[PDB]
Motif scaffolding. Structure first.
Motif, PDB file in Angstrom:
ATOM      1  N   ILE A  71     -44.668 -43.800  30.796  1.00 36.22           N
ATOM      2  CA  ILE A  71     -44.113 -42.482  30.471  1.00 36.22           C
ATOM      3  C   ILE A  71     -44.239 -41.504  31.645  1.00 36.22           C
ATOM      4  O   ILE A  71     -44.665 -40.374  31.461  1.00 36.22           O
ATOM      5  CB  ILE A  71     -44.814 -41.886  29.240  1.00 36.22           C
ATOM      6  N   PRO A  72     -43.819 -41.926  32.845  1.00 36.46           N
ATOM      7  CA  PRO A  72     -44.015 -41.018  33.988  1.00 36.46           C
ATOM      8  C   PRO A  72     -43.287 -39.684  33.806  1.00 36.46           C
ATOM      9  O   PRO A  72     -42.127 -39.670  33.390  1.00 36.46           O
ATOM     10  CB  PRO A  72     -43.429 -41.799  35.180  1.00 36.46           C
ATOM     11  N   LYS A  73     -43.975 -38.592  34.148  1.00 31.75           N
ATOM     12  CA  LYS A  73     -43.455 -37.214  34.122  1.00 31.75           C
ATOM     13  C   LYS A  73     -43.303 -36.666  32.708  1.00 31.75           C
ATOM     14  O   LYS A  73     -42.945 -35.509  32.540  1.00 31.75           O
ATOM     15  CB  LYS A  73     -42.092 -37.096  34.854  1.00 31.75           C
ATOM     16  N   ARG A  74     -43.576 -37.468  31.684  1.00 30.29           N
ATOM     17  CA  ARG A  74     -43.282 -36.979  30.343  1.00 30.29           C
ATOM     18  C   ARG A  74     -44.149 -35.778  29.986  1.00 30.29           C
ATOM     19  O   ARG A  74     -43.667 -34.831  29.362  1.00 30.29           O
ATOM     20  CB  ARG A  74     -43.456 -38.096  29.305  1.00 30.29           C
ATOM     21  N   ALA A  75     -45.431 -35.799  30.366  1.00 27.99           N
ATOM     22  CA  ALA A  75     -46.306 -34.696  29.999  1.00 27.99           C
ATOM     23  C   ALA A  75     -45.820 -33.380  30.611  1.00 27.99           C
ATOM     24  O   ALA A  75     -45.886 -32.341  29.950  1.00 27.99           O
ATOM     25  CB  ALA A  75     -47.762 -34.974  30.436  1.00 27.99           C
ATOM     26  N   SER A  76     -45.334 -33.430  31.856  1.00 32.64           N
ATOM     27  CA  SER A  76     -44.791 -32.241  32.513  1.00 32.64           C
ATOM     28  C   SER A  76     -43.547 -31.746  31.792  1.00 32.64           C
ATOM     29  O   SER A  76     -43.365 -30.538  31.642  1.00 32.64           O
ATOM     30  CB  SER A  76     -44.462 -32.528  33.977  1.00 32.64           C
ATOM     31  N   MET A  77     -42.708 -32.669  31.317  1.00 35.51           N
ATOM     32  CA  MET A  77     -41.472 -32.254  30.634  1.00 35.51           C
ATOM     33  C   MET A  77     -41.787 -31.563  29.316  1.00 35.51           C
ATOM     34  O   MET A  77     -41.185 -30.528  28.953  1.00 35.51           O
ATOM     35  CB  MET A  77     -40.578 -33.455  30.400  1.00 35.51           C
ATOM     36  N   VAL A  78     -42.747 -32.125  28.603  1.00 36.37           N
ATOM     37  CA  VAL A  78     -43.124 -31.574  27.306  1.00 36.37           C
ATOM     38  C   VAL A  78     -43.717 -30.181  27.511  1.00 36.37           C
ATOM     39  O   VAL A  78     -43.311 -29.206  26.856  1.00 36.37           O
ATOM     40  CB  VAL A  78     -44.145 -32.487  26.597  1.00 36.37           C
ATOM     41  N   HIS A  79     -44.699 -30.066  28.404  1.00 38.14           N
ATOM     42  CA  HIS A  79     -45.320 -28.768  28.592  1.00 38.14           C
ATOM     43  C   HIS A  79     -44.325 -27.731  29.115  1.00 38.14           C
ATOM     44  O   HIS A  79     -44.336 -26.567  28.687  1.00 38.14           O
ATOM     45  CB  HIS A  79     -46.493 -28.833  29.562  1.00 38.14           C
ATOM     46  N   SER A  80     -43.483 -28.163  30.044  1.00 36.92           N
ATOM     47  CA  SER A  80     -42.519 -27.263  30.667  1.00 36.92           C
ATOM     48  C   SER A  80     -41.567 -26.670  29.643  1.00 36.92           C
ATOM     49  O   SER A  80     -41.191 -25.489  29.750  1.00 36.92           O
ATOM     50  CB  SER A  80     -41.730 -27.994  31.756  1.00 36.92           C
ATOM     51  N   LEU A  81     -41.179 -27.475  28.657  1.00 39.13           N
ATOM     52  CA  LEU A  81     -40.203 -27.002  27.660  1.00 39.13           C
ATOM     53  C   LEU A  81     -40.913 -26.065  26.679  1.00 39.13           C
ATOM     54  O   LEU A  81     -40.357 -25.028  26.318  1.00 39.13           O
ATOM     55  CB  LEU A  81     -39.502 -28.151  26.938  1.00 39.13           C
ATOM     56  N   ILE A  82     -42.154 -26.390  26.306  1.00 39.89           N
ATOM     57  CA  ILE A  82     -42.955 -25.506  25.457  1.00 39.89           C
ATOM     58  C   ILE A  82     -43.130 -24.126  26.130  1.00 39.89           C
ATOM     59  O   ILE A  82     -42.971 -23.060  25.513  1.00 39.89           O
ATOM     60  CB  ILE A  82     -44.333 -26.173  25.142  1.00 39.89           C
ATOM     61  N   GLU A  83     -43.438 -24.151  27.420  1.00 39.33           N
ATOM     62  CA  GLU A  83     -43.579 -22.939  28.218  1.00 39.33           C
ATOM     63  C   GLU A  83     -42.250 -22.176  28.317  1.00 39.33           C
ATOM     64  O   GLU A  83     -42.218 -20.939  28.254  1.00 39.33           O
ATOM     65  CB  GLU A  83     -44.108 -23.314  29.605  1.00 39.33           C
ATOM     66  N   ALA A  84     -41.148 -22.914  28.470  1.00 38.73           N
ATOM     67  CA  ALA A  84     -39.821 -22.295  28.569  1.00 38.73           C
ATOM     68  C   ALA A  84     -39.454 -21.477  27.323  1.00 38.73           C
ATOM     69  O   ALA A  84     -38.775 -20.434  27.433  1.00 38.73           O
ATOM     70  CB  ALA A  84     -38.763 -23.367  28.821  1.00 38.73           C
ATOM     71  N   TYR A  85     -39.871 -21.965  26.155  1.00 37.78           N
ATOM     72  CA  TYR A  85     -39.713 -21.242  24.896  1.00 37.78           C
ATOM     73  C   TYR A  85     -40.835 -20.219  24.647  1.00 37.78           C
ATOM     74  O   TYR A  85     -40.881 -19.609  23.582  1.00 37.78           O
ATOM     75  CB  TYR A  85     -39.649 -22.235  23.725  1.00 37.78           C
ATOM     76  N   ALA A  86     -41.747 -20.076  25.612  1.00 39.75           N
ATOM     77  CA  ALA A  86     -42.855 -19.106  25.560  1.00 39.75           C
ATOM     78  C   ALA A  86     -43.837 -19.344  24.404  1.00 39.75           C
ATOM     79  O   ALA A  86     -44.542 -18.426  23.987  1.00 39.75           O
ATOM     80  CB  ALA A  86     -42.307 -17.668  25.497  1.00 39.75           C
ATOM     81  N   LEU A  87     -43.894 -20.570  23.904  1.00 35.81           N
ATOM     82  CA  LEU A  87     -44.764 -20.864  22.771  1.00 35.81           C
ATOM     83  C   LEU A  87     -46.240 -20.818  23.144  1.00 35.81           C
ATOM     84  O   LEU A  87     -47.089 -20.545  22.293  1.00 35.81           O
ATOM     85  CB  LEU A  87     -44.407 -22.229  22.176  1.00 35.81           C
ATOM     86  N   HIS A  88     -46.558 -21.068  24.411  1.00 37.08           N
ATOM     87  CA  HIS A  88     -47.956 -21.062  24.848  1.00 37.08           C
ATOM     88  C   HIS A  88     -48.581 -19.666  24.730  1.00 37.08           C
ATOM     89  O   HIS A  88     -49.803 -19.523  24.565  1.00 37.08           O
ATOM     90  CB  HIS A  88     -48.066 -21.570  26.288  1.00 37.08           C
ATOM     91  N   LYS A  89     -47.749 -18.632  24.800  1.00 37.37           N
ATOM     92  CA  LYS A  89     -48.228 -17.267  24.650  1.00 37.37           C
ATOM     93  C   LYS A  89     -48.691 -16.984  23.217  1.00 37.37           C
ATOM     94  O   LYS A  89     -49.366 -15.984  22.960  1.00 37.37           O
ATOM     95  CB  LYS A  89     -47.130 -16.271  25.061  1.00 37.37           C
ATOM     96  N   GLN A  90     -48.319 -17.852  22.283  1.00 38.26           N
ATOM     97  CA  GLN A  90     -48.729 -17.670  20.900  1.00 38.26           C
ATOM     98  C   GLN A  90     -49.865 -18.605  20.506  1.00 38.26           C
ATOM     99  O   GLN A  90     -50.223 -18.672  19.337  1.00 38.26           O
ATOM    100  CB  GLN A  90     -47.547 -17.882  19.957  1.00 38.26           C
ATOM    101  N   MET A  91     -50.409 -19.331  21.476  1.00 35.81           N
ATOM    102  CA  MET A  91     -51.482 -20.272  21.191  1.00 35.81           C
ATOM    103  C   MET A  91     -52.694 -19.922  22.024  1.00 35.81           C
ATOM    104  O   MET A  91     -52.595 -19.139  22.977  1.00 35.81           O
ATOM    105  CB  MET A  91     -51.035 -21.712  21.460  1.00 35.81           C
TER     106      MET A  91
END
Ligand SMILES: [K+]
Ligand SMILES: [Zn+2]
Lengths: 5, 363
Positions: free
Chosen positions: B21-41
């Motif tokens: 699963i190369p790069k998958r973790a970066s893709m997942v986190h990047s998309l979560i960050e793009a939707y600004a969801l990390h600011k709510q966690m």
């Protein structure tokens, strides 16, 4: 054993 | 009350190095960050698992072998086949330390739940539930799900493991086969020749753990409505019979339409309904990832589910971010099912459900 893959 | 999100840049970079699963973790986190969801966690940096923590499930000999071939990435060590290393689980340079980081991340999530920091804690890079005490298996080197459950056992008297990955959570079921403190419930593809080959409805655990393993064998082509009907029926019965105090939920995205495994035909909306059902129990819940081999769809799925956890409706348009071009040419969050048949016959599903109800009467 099985392969996944 | 705010969910915990296990994350650091260093952790994501280690997880990006996993062979299948190369790069998958970066893709997942990047998309979560793009939707600004990390600011709510509540962002929590993972601790690395100690040898002592890892050895509460895994054997010394296996941990020693993994450490040895990990040092230089010796994927040609003659002894690796005894310990399950080889094609599915190559000796990637660093894999011992990468797996220790993922184990530690899941333990950190569990500890957050024990401490009452949150009611939900997320490790999207965890979920490696096929590893056995002495054997790598199924892209899994250390069983972080087992390690998380064993940490939760410090406080939570009964733990429910719910697996919604395409593949039977056999390492977790085996680890707890003989106990009634942990009930395992797995919805997965079951078909001779299909990995790992275990998890028929008649597999119910052993000894003092008899009836504390629940398996729901499913055929190719299942879609959201039928999957949720099954999941809800089983979890309704499980909740009443077992009365769990904590839940570990594995949400591998290799069930989602577009996965190269091309087995189930789900969308994140269907999985999301299962997740909502579990969340309304209002129990300490540890969320894990798992399989998922269409990387952009896995990021779409887990980002959507993160939104479900937060009670948020996400915009259909994929926001600009590092991996934006991976989402072309339509750049939307929604996934469309494939036009192929559902091979699950209603009479078979009903009989599986009746069999499970019969087993749970003993619980
Ligand atoms: K059990
Ligand atoms: Zn899987």
């Amino acid at each position: 054993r099985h392969k996944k893959x | 009350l705010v969910p915990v999100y296990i994350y650091s840049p260093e952790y994501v970079s280690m997880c990006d190095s996993l062979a299948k699963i190369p790069k998958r973790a970066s893709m997942v986190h990047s998309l979560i960050e793009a939707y600004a969801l990390h600011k709510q966690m509540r962002i929590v940096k993972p601790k690395v698992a100690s040898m002592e923590e890892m050895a509460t499930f895994h054997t010394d000999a296996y941990l020693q072998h993994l450490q040895k071939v990990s040092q230089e990435g010796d994927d040609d060590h003659p002894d690796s086949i005894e310990y399950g290393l080889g094609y599915d689980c190559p000796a990637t340079e660093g894999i011992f330390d990468y797996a220790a980081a993922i184990g530690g991340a899941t333990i950190t999530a569990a500890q957050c739940l024990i401490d009452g920091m949150c009611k939900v804690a997320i490790n999207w890079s965890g979920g490696w539930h096929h590893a056995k005490k002495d054997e790598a298996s199924g892209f899994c080197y250390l069983n972080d799900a087992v390690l998380g459950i064993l940490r939760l056992r410090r406080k939570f008297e009964r733990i429910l493991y719910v697996n919604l990955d395409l593949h039977h959570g056999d390492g977790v079921e085996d680890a707890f086969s003989f106990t009634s403190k942990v009930m395992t419930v797995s919805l997965h593809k079951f078909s001779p020749g299909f990995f790992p080959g275990t998890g028929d409805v008649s597999d119910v655990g052993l000894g003092k753990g008899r009836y504390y393993s629940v398996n729901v064998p499913i055929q190719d082509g299942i879609q959201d409505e039928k999957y949720y009907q099954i999941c809800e029926s089983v979890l309704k019965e499980v909740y009443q019979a077992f009365n769990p105090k904590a839940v570990v939920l594995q949400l591998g995205a290799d069930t989602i339409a577009g996965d190269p495994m091309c087995s189930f035909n789900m969308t994140p909306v269907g999985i999301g309904k299962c997740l909502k059902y579990i969340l309304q129990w209002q129990l300490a819940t540890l969320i894990l990832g798992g399989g998922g081999f269409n990387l952009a769809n896995t990021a779409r799925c887990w980002t959507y589910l993160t939104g479900v956890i937060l009670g948020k409706t996400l915009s259909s348009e994929i926001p600009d971010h590092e991996f934006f071009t991976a989402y072309g040419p339509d750049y939307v969050l929604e996934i469309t099912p494939s036009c192929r048949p559902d091979r699950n016959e209603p009479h078979r599903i009903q009989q599986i459900l009746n069999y499970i109800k019969g087993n749970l009467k003993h619980v």
